[PDB]
Amino acid sequence: CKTGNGKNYRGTMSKTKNGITCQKWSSTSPHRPRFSPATHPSEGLEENYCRNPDNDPQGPWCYTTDPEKRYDYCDILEC
C-alpha cells in the first residue's frame, strides 16, 4: 500500500487496488479528476498515477478513464 509514501512502489504504474486499469489524469473528458499538482500530502499523479496526494489513511488511490470504475487504491507492493 506504500513502500514509504511517495518514493518506492510498483502498482502505481496505473492499476487500481488490484489491477483496475487507472487513467492519465486527463480530468473530466470523458471521465477523470483534476487534482494532479504537487503540494498535497505527496505527489505522483502524473500521466496516470497512484499515490496519496489526496490524504487517505489506507491505500494509494487513483482513478480510471471511466466512471463505473472511477477509482480505488492500487496494487502497489507493501500489501
Q: Provide the annotated binding site for L-lysine.
A: 34, 56, 70
Write down the experimental method used for this entry: NMR
Q: Which fold has domain 1-79?
A: Plasminogen Kringle 4 (2.40.20)
Domain-by-domain residue ranges, the chain? 1-79
Cα separation, 61 vs 39, whole angstroms: 16
Which DSSP string do the residues of the chain spell out, in sequence order?
--SSSSSS-SGGGTEETTTEE------SSSS------S-SS----SSS--B-TT--SS--BEE-SSSTT-EE----TT-
Cα separation, 67 vs 79, whole angstroms: 26
Q: Letter for the amino acid at 3?
A: T
Pick from 69, 46, 67, 71: which is nearest to 59 by CA? Answer: 71
CB 72 within 8 A of CB 20: yes
Q: Provide the annotated binding site.
A: 34, 56, 70
Cα separation, 24 vs 47, whole angstroms: 4
**Residue 64 cell numbers, joined:** 480510471
